[PDB]
C-alpha cells in the first residue's frame, strides 16, 4: 500500500546538506553561479557542487589510490546513500543481510572517459559496502532517472520482494564538452531516500518524513523529435496515477513541475487539463519548481524535488519559486486549478486533512514519472555518545552537533541521546557526556572542542584500553554491576566504560518509555582530494 | 568591585616569558641551578657549618638591555641598575601583552606599584634609588597616575597589588601597572643565611625535610583595570581579583617570625568582608617558601580558617611554585598570581615540587587541604567558575593574601615593526615560534592585534595569509630572505616621497579610503610598511576581532655593567 520514506540525504548547489537547503529554499536563494576556470575555461552558469573531488575512502575500506580512478559521481553517491541510511537512524550491523534494493539514477560517464566506473558498479557500492541483498540497478532514463527509480523501488516493495529501498540520483557536469523561458541551466547533485514499506516503518519505529500514495510511469512514443514532449502522455500518466490510486485532484495543493524553464506550457497545460476533469475548483494548487533554485540537476532531478517537498510537508511550509515575473504567454492561470507560489507562506490545509502533493519528472527520451506523496500523520539526565573512525572526524561529529542543537531549540534531548545510542556505530574513536538540558548539551560540546575540562565528559580512543574493559566482559558479577549500573542510573559509569569500548545493551537503559529515533547530521567525512592520476 | 588583569609579562629562573614558565610548570621543572663562578665563586665562601648553600634560582642574562629603546644614552645604562632595566622591560611588555602602546598609555592616569628590596648595584658602584626604580615607566610612557615603590621584603609585589586595587576601586587611577623584582647580585646579599637558607638549596614546601629557601631571582608584572571598563574596552582578560588584604605579624618571637594569629586574621577578614566562602576556593598558591616553623604555621592557620566554614575535606590542592624556581623575593607575589592565572586558563593544575613526605608538624588526612603533585584537570562543579588564593609573607611582618576568580566571558593583514631591523627580524622569529606552538590561535585576532595593539615603528615588514600554514610560510620566507609576492618590507625614513601623495592630495586620500574601504590588502600592505598612517578601524564592518595575547617586543640584547 503506502510507502514511507524514513530516510534523506542531500547534497545540492549551495547546500551541503537537507538542513542548508531547506534553509536556502526558505530565502528564495539562488544557487547558479559562472563557471569558474578550474573547472574549464568558458552558457556560461551552472549550478556546481563544491569540492567534488573530495572522498574518504579508507572509511569505505577503498585504498587511496584506488579513490583517483574512481567516477566522483560513484563516490558521492556513496557517501550521501550512507548518510540517508544514517538519517533513517540505521547502521552497518543493522543493515547487514538486509533485503535492501539500490536504485541509482544515473546518466554520464565523464570521468571513465577522461582516465570500475560502469553504472552497474555504481549502484553496487553500497550493497558491496554494507551487505545488501536486494538488487542493485543505475537507471538511466535521463532526467526522470531518480524518479523511475523510486517507481521501481516502491513496486519491489509492495510486491515484498525487498524490504527497503535506497533511491537516488547523482550528476556531475565534469567537461566542456557535455555542455520569459529560454532553456534550462545545468545543475548537479547527489540525492537519497530510503524507503519502506509503511506498516514496517510504523512497527520498527522509524521517523517518516512522508508517504507515497501513488507513482506511474510511461513513454511519449512518437513525437516530432525524440526529445520533444507529448501533452497526451503528460495527462495519461497523471490520469491513470489518480484513477488507479484513487486520488482526487481536489485533495493536491502542491505540485513540483519538471518545470526546466523552455516544454512548460505543455507541461502547464497537461496538469491543468487532467485536474479539471474531476474540479471546477481555482487556484488551489501552488506550483514550483526547485529548478530556479538550484538549475536542472538531472538524473538527480527527481530526488531534489522529493526532498523539497518534504521539507515543506515537514514545516508546513510553501516556499518561492524563482525567476517568475510574468505567466508564460501560452497558459492562462485565472480560470486555471494551478497558481504559480512566489511566496514564503503557511501550507494552509483543511480540516485536519493531510497534505498531498506531486513531483513530475520528465526524460529526454520521453521515459516519464510522477509521484504523489502525501503529510504522515502520527498518533533527568541524558547520556550523549558519538564516536567516528579517526579524531578528527570526532571533533568535525561534535561540531556538526553543537550547530543543530543550536538551530533547533526544540528539540527532544531523550530521542537525540537514544539516536545516538541505538542509530549510530560505535567505532573506534569516542567521547560521551550527561546532559540533562539543551544549555549543559551545548555546553558540554563546546568544552570537548576547546578542550576545557569538565567533570561530564569522557572521551577515548578503544585500541588503547583494551586491558582495561576486559574486567567487564567476562566476568559474571562484573556484567551484573554494569546491569546494576545500567539497570540503571549511574549513567557516568556508563558512559566512561563505553567510551573505552565496552559494549553497552542500550535497551536496558529503557524502562516502558522508549524514546525514538529521529533525523540527526550524519557522519562527516574526511575531505580529502583525489582526481585524475 | 571586581579587578581585571589584562595584560601580564614575566622573566624567572628557566623562563624568559610566561609561555616558557608555563611549559615548565606543565612538565615540573626545577629551574634551580649551582651558582656558577660568572656570578661568584662559592668556593670563596662555602663552609657547610661564609655561606651554606651553593644554589640559586637564576635569570639569564641580567646584563642585557636595550637602552636606546627607552632613549637613554648607552652610558648611562652601564649606571643603572639591572633590576631597574630588567622591570623596565617587563613592566613595558607587560602593556603591550595587553594590547597597549605609547599612543594609547599617553597621558592615562595609570599607577605604578612596583616591588623591590635591595640595592647590590648602587653599592657596588661605590639614579639608583627605589623611588627612580617605579618612575622609570611612568617617565617614559608619559603615565600620570602615582609611582610608588613598596618594599616589604617578599610579599612587595602583592602588597602593590592591593594598593593598585583599592585605588582603582576608589576611581583614583584608571589602569595600574603592578610588579616585583629581585635579583642576588654579591656573594654578602644573597648569603644571610640568619638561618634562612636550606644547606640542600631546594625549596621544600610542605615537606617535612622543610629546612630553609633557596634564593631566586625574578622580574614580572600584571596589567590592572577595573572589570568594567575592562570589558568596555573589549580587552582580553587573565581572571579578576574578587577580594585582597594587608596586614602584619606586630609581636612575633623574633622579627622575623610569623604569626599564626595574624595569617588567620587576614584570611578570615578577607572572606568576611568580600563574601568568600572557603568551599568555593580550589587551588592556593602558598608563601610555602619550605622553612621548619613557617610552613605548619602557614598549613595550621589556612586550614583553620576553611575548617571554621566547612566540613569537607580535602578539596583545595595547596602548592608553591618555589619548589620550581626558588624563593623570587620580591617578585614572589607576581610569580605566584601568574601561576594561577595560567592554571586558570589552562583549566590545569601542576604538580609542586619536592614533597616527598607530608610535614609531621600537621596533618592533612582530615584537613580541607591536599598536596598537588599531578599535572591533572583542574576540575570545577556545575556553572562555576574556578577561585584560588595567592598568599606571600615577608621577614618584616607585613602579609598579603589574595583572592582570584576565573573570567567567564560571554585572508588577513599581518604588521610587524621593530626600532632596528635586527629586531624586526627576532620579531618574526619570535611569531613564528607563537604560531607554531598554538594550533588554534585565532588568525583576524592576531592581525587585529599587531595592526592596533603594537606601535607601527621604522622598520616594517607586512604580508597577508588566509591560514596558520600560510602565515608561517610568509615569516619563514622573511627570515630565509627568500622572495614572495605578498611580503612587503621597508624602512620608513627611507620612504617618505614615495608615501607623500597619500597624504596631501585629496583624492589620493579617498582612494586610500576606499582601499581601506574596498578591502584591498595588498595595497593597504605595501603603502603601510612605507609609513602611510592607516585607519585600522574602517577595514572592520559589522565585526571587529579583539585584542588577544601576543609575543611581546623582542629587546635588543646588548651588553651593560660595571663602568
Not at 585500541?463 to 567476562?474: D, P, V
Request: charged share 25%.
Amino acid at each position: 500500500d503506502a510507502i514511507a520514506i524514513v530516510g534523506m540525504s542531500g547534497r545540492y548547489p549551495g547546500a551541503r546538506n537537507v538542513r542548508e537547503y531547506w534553509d536556502n529554499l526558505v530565502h528564495a536563494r539562488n544557487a547558479i553561479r559562472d563557471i569558474p576556470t578550474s573547472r574549464w575555461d568558458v552558457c556560461k552558469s551552472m549550478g556546481m557542487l563544491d569540492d567534488i573531488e573530495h572522498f574518504d575512502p579508507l572509511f569505505f575500506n577503498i585504498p587511496p589510490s584506488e579513490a583517483e580512478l574512481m567516477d566522483p559521481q560513484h563516490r558521492i553517491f556513496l557517501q550521501e546513500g550512507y548518510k540517508a541510511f544514517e538519517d533513517a537512524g540505521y547502521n552497518a550491523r543493522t543493515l547487514n543481510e538486509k533485503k535492501c534494493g539500490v536504485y541509482l539514477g544515473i546518466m554520464s560517464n565523464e570521468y571513465g572517459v577522461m582516465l570500475g566506473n560502469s553504472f552497474a558498479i555504481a549502484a553496487a557500492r553500497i550493497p558491496y559496502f554494507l551487505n545488501l541483498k536486494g538488487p542493485a540497478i543505475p537507471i538511466d532514463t535521463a532526467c526522470s532517472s531518480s524518479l523511475v527509480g523510486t517507481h521501481l523501488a516502491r513496486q519491489a516493495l509492495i510486491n515484498k520482494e525487498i524490504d527497503m529501498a535506497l533511491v537516488g540520483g547523482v550528476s556531475l557536469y565534469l567537461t566542456p564538452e557535455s555542455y520569459g523561458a529560454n532553456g534550462f541551466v545545468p545543475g548537479e547533485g547527489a540525492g537519497a531516500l530510503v524507503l519502506k514499506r509503511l506498516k514496517d516503518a510504523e512497527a520498527d519505529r522509524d521517523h517518516i518524513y512522508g508517504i507515497i500514495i501513488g507513482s506511474g510511469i510511461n513513454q511519449d512514443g512518437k513525437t516530432n523529435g525524440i526529445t520533444a514532449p507529448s501533452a497526451k502522455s503528460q495527462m495519461d500518466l497523471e490520469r491513470d496515477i489518480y484513477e488507479t490510486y484513487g486520488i482526487h485532484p481536489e485533495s493536491i495543493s502542491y505540485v513540483e513541475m519538471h518545470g526546466t524553464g523552455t516544454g512548460d506550457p505543455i507541461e502547464l497545460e497537461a496538469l491543468s487539463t487532467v485536474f479539471q476533469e474531476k474540479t471546477d475548483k481555482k487556484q488551489f494548487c501552488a506550483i514550483g519548481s526547485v529548478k530556479s533554485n538550484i538549475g536542472h540537476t538531472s538524473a538527480a532531478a527527481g530526488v531534489a524535488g522529493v526532498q523539497k517537498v518534504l521539507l515543506c510537508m515537514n514545516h508546513k511550509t510553501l516556499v518561492p519559486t524563482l525567476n517568475f515575473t510574468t505567466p508564460n504567454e501560452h497558459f492562462e492561470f485565472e480560470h486555471s486549478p494551478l497558481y504559480v507560489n512566489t511566496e514564503l507562506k503557511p501550507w494552509e490545509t483543511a480540516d485536519g486533512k493531510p497534505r498531498r502533493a506531486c513531483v513530475s519528472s520528465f526524460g529526454y527520451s520521453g521515459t516519464n514519472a510522477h509521484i504523489v506523496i502525501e503529510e504522515y500523520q502520527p498518533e533527568r539526565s541524558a547520556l550523549f555518545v558519538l564516536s567516528a573512525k579517526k579524531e578528527k572526524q570526532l571533533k568535525a561529529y561534535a561540531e556538526a552537533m553543537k550547530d543543530f542543537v543550536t538551530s533547533n531549540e526544540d528539540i527532544d534531548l531523550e530521542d537525540m541521546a537514544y539516536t545516538l545510542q541505538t542509530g549510530r556505530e560505535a567505532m573506534d574513536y569516542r567521547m560521551a557526556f550527561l546532559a540533562d538540558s539543551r544549555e549543559m548539551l551545548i555546553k558540554a560540546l563546546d568544552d570537548y572542542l576547546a578542550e576545557m575540562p569538565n567533570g561530564s565528559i569522557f572521551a577515548a580512543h578503544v585500541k588503547t584500553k583494551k586491558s582495561e574493559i576486559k574486567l567487564f566482559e567476562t566476568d559474571h558479577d562484573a556484567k551484573a554491576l554494569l546491569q546494576t549500573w545500567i539497570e540503571k542510573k549511574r549513567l557516568e559509569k556508563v558512559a566512561e566504560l563505553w567510551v573505552k569500548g565496552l559494549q553497552i545493551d542500550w535497551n536496558k537503559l529503557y524502562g516502558e518509555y522508549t524514546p525514538r529515533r529521529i533525523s540527526l547530521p550524519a557522519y562527516p567525512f574526511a575531505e580529502e582530494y583525489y582526481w585524475l592520476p
